[PDB]
Amino acid sequence: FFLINGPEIMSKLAGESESNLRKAFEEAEKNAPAIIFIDELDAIAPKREKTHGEVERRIVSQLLTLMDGLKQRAHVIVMAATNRPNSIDPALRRFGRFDREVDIGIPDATGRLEILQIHTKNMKLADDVDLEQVA
Amino acid sequence: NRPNRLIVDEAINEDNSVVSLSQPKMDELQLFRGDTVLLKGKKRREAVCIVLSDDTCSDEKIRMNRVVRNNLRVRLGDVISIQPCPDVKYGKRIHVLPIDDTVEGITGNLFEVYLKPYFLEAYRPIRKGDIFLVRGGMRAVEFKVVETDPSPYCIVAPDTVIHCEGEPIKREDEEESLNEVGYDDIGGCRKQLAQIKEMVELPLRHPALFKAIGVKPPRGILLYGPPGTGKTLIARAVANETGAFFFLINGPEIMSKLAGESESNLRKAFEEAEKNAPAIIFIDELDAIAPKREKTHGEVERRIVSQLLTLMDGLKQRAHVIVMAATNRPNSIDPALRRFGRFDREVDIGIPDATGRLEILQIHTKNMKLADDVDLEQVANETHGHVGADLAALCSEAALQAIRKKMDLIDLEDETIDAEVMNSLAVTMDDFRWALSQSNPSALRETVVEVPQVTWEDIGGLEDVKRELQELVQYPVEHPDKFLKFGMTPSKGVLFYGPPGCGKTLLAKAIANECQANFISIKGPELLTMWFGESEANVREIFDKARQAAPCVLFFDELDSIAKARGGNIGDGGGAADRVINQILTEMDGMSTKKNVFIIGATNRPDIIDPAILRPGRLDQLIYIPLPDEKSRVAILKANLRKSPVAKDVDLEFLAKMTNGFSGADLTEICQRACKLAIRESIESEIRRERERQTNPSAMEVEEDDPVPEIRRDHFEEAMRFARRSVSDNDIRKYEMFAQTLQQSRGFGSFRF
Amino acid sequence: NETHGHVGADLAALCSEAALQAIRKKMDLIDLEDETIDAEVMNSLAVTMDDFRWALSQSNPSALRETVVEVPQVTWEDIGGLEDVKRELQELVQYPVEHPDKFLKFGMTPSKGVLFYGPPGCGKTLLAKAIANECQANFISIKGPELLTMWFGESEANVREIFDKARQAAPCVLFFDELDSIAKARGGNIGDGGGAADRVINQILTEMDGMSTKKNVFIIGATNRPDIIDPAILRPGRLDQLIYIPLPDEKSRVAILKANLRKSPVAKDVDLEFLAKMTNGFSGADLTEICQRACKLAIRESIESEIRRERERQTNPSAMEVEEDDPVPEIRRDHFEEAMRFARRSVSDNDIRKYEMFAQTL
Amino acid sequence: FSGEGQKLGSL
């Protein structure tokens, strides 16, 4: 899983970040049926719709070219870890515009006790405490 | 067209190079029983075989075996042209290689010791590049023709020296060759496809036609539209069909850190394509290449734009050099490129129609059978018309549902997948239905929000109004032909006058849930913005998306707060509200498609309505939603009691007569109050039972938990004594004033005799 | 002469397109020619004046292709009413352009025309579209969201681009929308966006008052009522010339209703005369709405009849082919009367007074 | 993979 990073999207050179991202994608694909740990997924969010940043626009174009075109369906897939889906734009919302159609994540309190159960089981800290009951 | 393209029927004989031809076929065509003719297949698939004379095994159709179809990459019944192939001589040094996926298991020299006589004095005029499975070593070893010293169709004989190495061909190349590109997700783009072919095939297959025409075709052709919806697929299909060099050009490709690297790369690519062949400039993702050199604050970007213009717009620059330009944002087009000379041609890719939707969906689904008893055309017609890879998404969702059903009946099957169970594990219309119910338009997904489910039947009262709305929705779609025959357009601006939220917003939600088409809900404070013109731009974008998202429903909820007249107070402030109203009118007016403009009007105060959009055309009708009659009261009561446990001691009619002046919100409140009283009573009973059980051994499994699962008549009486109707006589007066305005605006029926 | 808009290699491109269309027709009707084409057909591949005309009608100016998109075209004849106004507009379009001798004899330049105080809702946009389709010349029409942007000076750039495009493609009339939304004075909406929008409006006026007085630079304006529009630059020193419009009528209403019916499946038993008589105080949008309601009732009746026929066929497979195809091919006079009864007028007396006062403000 | 370099399957 080639870990992405927002800082990796920055290039003091000309197009170096986009070329480097393309090279990383190619290296991961040629490496193995690897994964694409797409981190900071909400970085180029708006598909440069209202964005005036040409470097940002160039990055979006390179990202779409990686996500589309010939042999886009490699033996890898990316993670749409979206901080804000409204910021995100349809240029990835299509099954093929990105890896797929993305879901959303949110917390629940009933399952939180199970999450609380895991957190408590991480380190023993109570015996007679009805920790699940209180949670 | 030509009679030489005979239908490729199925051959009973298992011989690969033998086609059962009718006596009429062997006679009308120069087709002897031993004539080595050449057959041309898909994507330049040419091969030479023998034509068997079988009149009883062919009726104007070339009976072809499945091996022949697989080798030629053709289906059954295909109109394949057949031409004589007498130039097939013995190859000098033909390179051969087995297939790794097919030579896996056949040990030893499974070519010379298995297919020995298959090529020795066997007159095998196969194309250089073909793979044929050979039954050798109790298997089917396929050897791919690596190369041939002679031309592709070379007669492999004992004299022909078949060069052979130990290179086993992996099945990945087999899949890639099977991964051809045609009309599988493209339905209805006949005009664009024809234009492209004429710019290519007619340009190539009839170059003399262009020469006699005294004019070259458009070397620069632009492809606007939503990309990757098949746009990338369109480029792939072109490249697969195209025999000339396809100089694929990515967008962020030439831009490099070194000085002038991008321009040098572009010039090098152009020169290489020119010296290579009558190539086509496959400029992929060319949309983000230049902002018309006006907003191009980047000097490197400006230089890139200038170099691109010089290469494209240049004297004697594009000789037999087409420019496959693809655009995702036609607005983002550069000024010079949009003109002829830089891009002489330009095409915009539109969304497909329901018929084209069905065609593309069936073509995509041709890979599998996910419903043996269901027609995909039926669902596609039932489909709203989500376009692009929406069909692919629907297919994937149906596959996921089928996999859920199968692996639900199966184990993890990490290594032991039951092939018989895996063999067409699920082919279900129910899977497609579940996918579609779980499916929605991806474009509006960012605007999509979760809404409660309610049926048009689940809402009580206003049966005439609900029926009218449903008919308006259906007839506009269901009987488009009837509208064409009548020759009239439908209504858009349906409003609602009365106390909203009494079920009003609930009515809108129930309609949207019961709506077969899309629905876009608009909040009153939703589109406001602080940046200069940002709110108006947002409104314009929403309108444009809705127009693209046909069919859709403009649920402009809380339109009262957005529809204030320009100057409803002592003065206006900011003026952007007037700009928003003007932009809405530009959406509400103007010559365009407006294919499914279902504008939903919700306003509790009709006086807060700007007349301009309230005007006809800009507005269709307003639903003067009154309070419920005792009959309507009983209807709403029954609708509420749908999920409630009913008590026979409750006089619903007596209440409805008593609650003549009440409201649907009031009725819901009374129901909630009775439910709360019952819940409190149940909680108290449970507490008392526990306390008795706390102090003494007592039974727990008793029906006392629900002493009255139905509504206690005492609870109903208490709720009645609690509150009453919230209808205001002044509010009634205002509503009646709006109604009287409408009525005086109306008049008696014509009844002209 | 017709190809006023086409410039540069645009004419050659149009000729190539005409040749392509004609050759496509000739070959497709002649032969697929997957291998070779007939030399007789090849020598007989001459284009036709009809083919050139068809392509040119399909063709459009190169800058407009990058500028504007298409719209539903209508015929000036297809729209009834304002016959004198239509004649004046057509004269201004042609005799000032199609006749240079008229300009020489008169000398007077074409009037700018400020804002047609037209019907409030029936849409002067309808008239503008019908004229532009009839005009066969460059036509500019934009909405108010055209220039307002979160880019400093973006509106000024948009105005400059519009002016330059008009200069390139003169003559062209700017059928700009949001007439009231731009005509409002600097004050009132205190403080708007700090006056930057007002600054852009003032610059555009100066860029257009204020525009180049050559090549028949024209503009087209209209509003539901002129009172919403402030005459800040609409004064005939900054708006150059002015042209208003009236509200709808009764005889013109009958004419427009007749045109709409002619566009659709007409009926005889309908009392069109009494309908027009009752239609003295209505609007053309109201007539279109009545027509749509009647059509909806007819379609509902047809659907109900089809449902009954299908139910009978299912219940008895003998009545499938024993039904008339069009239960009401003409409009049911009962349906028209019912639609009228359910209908109401959009005429507002207070709005009429306000519009007249705005006209009276002249 | 090679052409005319290995001894071939003589018949």
Tertiary shape of chain D? elongated
* Residues in helix, % of chain A: 25-40%
Largest interface: B-C, 83 and 92 residues
General form of chain A: elongated
Through-space gap between termini of chain A: 35 Å
Summarize the biggest pleated sheet of chain D. Answer: none
Layout of secondary structure:
This is part of a larger assembly, with three copies of chain A and one copy of chain D (11 residues).
Chain A: E1 2-3, H1 16-31, E2 36-37, H2 54-67, H3 90-93, H4 109-122, H5 131-134
Chain D: no helix or strand
PDB class: chaperone
Keywords: AAA+ ATPase, p97, VCP, Cdc48, unfoldase, protein phosphatase-1, protein maturation, chaperone
Entry title: p97-p37-SPI substrate complex
Question: What do you see in this structure?
Answer:
This is part of a larger assembly, with three copies of chain A and one copy of chain D (11 residues). Chain A has 135 residues and is mainly α. Chain A is built from five helices and two strands. In chain A, strands 1-2 form a two-stranded parallel sheet. Chain A is elongated, with a radius of gyration of 20 Å. By secondary structure, chain D is mostly loops. The interface between A and B is medium-sized, with 35 and 35 residues. It is classed as chaperone. The entry lists the keywords AAA+ ATPase, p97, VCP, Cdc48, unfoldase, protein phosphatase-1, protein maturation, chaperone.
